[PDB]
């Protein structure tokens, strides 16, 4: 739910 993009 936060910016879980690597």
């Amino acid at each position, epitope marked *: *739910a*936060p*910016d*879980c*993009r*690597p």
Partner: single-chain antibody, 225 residues
Framework: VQLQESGGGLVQPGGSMKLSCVAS????????MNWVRQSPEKGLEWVAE??????????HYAESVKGRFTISRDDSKSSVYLQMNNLRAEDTGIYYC????????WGQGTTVTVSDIVVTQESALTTSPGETVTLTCRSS?????????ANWVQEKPDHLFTGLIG???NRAPGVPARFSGSLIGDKAALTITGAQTEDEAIYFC?????????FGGGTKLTVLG
């Protein structure tokens, strides 16, 4: 990757100030950006986030600054901004732009001088080179789980921050293999398998709670001999 803040300085209580941060070395527009501030008394404190163009640039704010600060971004200039109105003494601190999975990258900070969930970490731990040491991070709400997206951030001498772990268990790029993050029991945990002298630092965890981050008070890790 560089993030580089500017705009800090002296402001009178009730006054306004705009901070800027320019990003390079990563695809800025693909990542959310945050402002986090560090004070003498209140420690590390998350201020604001701004999401992507596909999220209609949605913003969220700490309760302490809601209604006084506005975060924004210009993807065309790879920059994020913090407009701050009605400043108070409690707003004094060093302000950092930071982001990526979720706090891999930190700028150098810009100082602003004006004039409830608790995350708990060990105050201090002492180790020696080659030992295995585990730092922990507890939430006042219950268990830490993957939904808290635990991050671990290292502070080295004089306010230099680098993210080590995000999303509970994911080493940021270029982070040494001796660092790992996990959940242990009902807490987030940072393990250093074979501590090294240069690992002497303050380590902060941050946990996500739906729409905001809460940082722990930090653990001072001393590495003796």
């Amino acid at each position: 990757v560089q993030l580089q803040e500017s705009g800090g300085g002296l402001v009178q209580p009730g006054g306004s100030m705009k901070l800027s941060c320019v990003a390079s070395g990563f695809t800025f527009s693909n990542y959310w950006m945050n402002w986090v501030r560090q004070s003498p008394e209140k420690g590390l404190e998350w201020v604001a986030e701004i999401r992507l163009k596909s999220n209609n640039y949605a913003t969220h704010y700490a309760e302490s600054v809601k209604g006084r600060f506005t975060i924004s971004r210009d993807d065309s200039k790879s920059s994020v901004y913090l407009q701050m109105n009605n400043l108070r003494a409690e707003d004094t601190g060093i302000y950092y732009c930071t982001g990526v999975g979720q706090f891999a990258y930190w700028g150098q900070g810009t100082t602003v001088t004006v004039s409830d969930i608790v995350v708990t970490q060990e105050s201090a731990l002492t180790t020696s080179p080659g030992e295995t040491v585990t730092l922990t991070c507890r939430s006042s709400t219950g268990a830490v789980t993957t939904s808290n997206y635990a991050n671990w951030v290292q502070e080295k001498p004089d306010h230099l921050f680098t993210g080590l772990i995000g999303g509970t268990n994911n080493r940021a790029p270029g982070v040494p293999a001796r660092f790992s993050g996990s959940l242990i029991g009902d807490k987030a945990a940072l393990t250093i398998t074979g501590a090294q002298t240069e690992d002497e630092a303050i380590y902060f965890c941050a946990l996500w709670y739906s729409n905001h981050w809460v940082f722990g008070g930090g653990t001072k890790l001393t590495v003796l001999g």
